[PDB]
Amino acid sequence: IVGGKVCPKGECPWQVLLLVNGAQLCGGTLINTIWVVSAAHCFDKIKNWRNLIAVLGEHDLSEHDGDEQSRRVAQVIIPSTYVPGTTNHDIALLRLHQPVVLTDHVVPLCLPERTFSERTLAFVRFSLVSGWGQLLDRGATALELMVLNVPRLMTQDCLQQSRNITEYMFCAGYSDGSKDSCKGDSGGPHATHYRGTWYLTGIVSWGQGCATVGHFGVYTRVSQYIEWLQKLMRSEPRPGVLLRAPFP
């Protein structure tokens, strides 16, 4: 996160930390006790699928306080329409091997319904993005979780404000190279507040470099995937670690 502040411990209870072999890989969002939404591109070059870990309750990466929670990722589900190496349909549904135990520090983010999210949330101006990614383009990632409040644009206004952006995405952020999300933040939550409740509206995806002036952040439009997400969450687990499910 470039141009943000530290998320006070506990105020980003749904944020997830994805690790490969112990290494920081990506961020993700907890939407239930066994389900984590992330970003497809985070798995394009995955090393050993049998070393994928999700960490809930994490805050400061240099200290263990007992609130952290570790679970093995049992399955990573990706829409059929996703093309590795590209950016459209950048969404992934992870199934934890065992459930996280909800506590004051581990809480799921509401996955809203299609209608509510398209005609009401999609219009809330400011939302939050978080992750332990780079604090500057070509800079070092963060030790403490970062959060940044960014403004969502209209697909039309985004294109023009820049002289590649499907309807499965939406822009948000700022063009003055001062605020944005970076690599390390991919797969993290774009969360919207409405009537006393946060909901998942975007997934940190790609974007021309990090905090690149003249550019906005691109986030996967979650709303285009609620039904996909739900059908899978209500299905029975099929063998295999990496699975591609049809989309729509």
* Residue 161 binding other proteins, by CB under 8 A: no
Q: Which CB sits closer to Ca ion, 9 or 193?
A: 9
Total number of residues binding Ca ion (CB under 5 A)? 1
Q: Which CB sits closer to other proteins, 14 or 132?
A: 14
Q: What torsion do the CA atoms of 167, 172, 177, 179 make, to the nearest 10 degrees?
A: -150
* Residue 10 binding other proteins, by CB under 8 A: yes
Residue 180 is labelled as binding a ligand: yes
Give yes or no for a contact between 53 and 28, defined as CB atoms under 8 angstroms apart.
no
Burial pattern 108-124, b for ≥16 Cβ within 10 A else e, equals bbbbbeeeebbeebbee
Q: Is 90 a catalytic residue?
A: yes
Site string for Ca ion, 38-77 (x = CB under 5 A): ------------------------------x---------
Q: Which CB sits closer to other proteins, 29 or 134?
A: 29
Q: Which CB sits closer to Ca ion, 67 or 137?
A: 67
Cβ-based neighbours of 63, under 8 Å, separated by 6 or more: none
Give, as ranges, the residues between 104 and 143 that touch other proteins (CB under 8 A). Answer: 104-105, 107-113, 115-116, 119-120
Using CB under 8 A, pick the residue from 22, 66, 85, 196 that binds other proteins.
196
Cα 15–Cα 20–Cα 21 angle in degrees, nearest 5: 130
Give yes or no for a contact between 211 and 230, defined as CB atoms under 8 angstroms apart.
no
Give, as ranges, the residues between 168 and 187 that touch Ca ion (CB under 5 A). Answer: none
Which residues are 150's β-sheet partners? Answer: 127
Q: What is the DSSP letter of 165?
A: -
* Residue 63 binding other proteins, by CB under 8 A: no
Q: Which CB sits closer to other proteins, 40 or 148?
A: 148
Q: In what order do the strands lie in the sheet with 217-221?
A: 5-6, 146-151, 126-131, 189-194, 197-204, 217-221, 169-172
Integer CA distances (angstroms), 166 to 11, 37, 151, in order: 32, 20, 19
Tokens 């404000």 belong to which residue? 161
Count other C-beta atoms under 10 Å from residue 85's C-beta.
7
Give, as ranges, the residues between 17 and 46 that touch other proteins (CB under 8 A). Answer: 31-32
Q: Is 41 a catalytic residue?
A: yes
Set 38, 175, 186, 205: catalytic member? 186
Q: Is 190 a catalytic residue?
A: no
Q: What is the DSSP letter of 51?
A: G
Which residues are annotated binding-site positions for substrate? 180
Positions at the binding site: 180
Q: List the catalytic residues.
A: 41, 90, 186
Give the binding site for Ca ion (CB under 5 A). 68
Chain positions contacting other proteins, by CB under 8 A: 8-11, 13-14, 31-32, 102-105, 107-113, 115-116, 119-120, 195-199
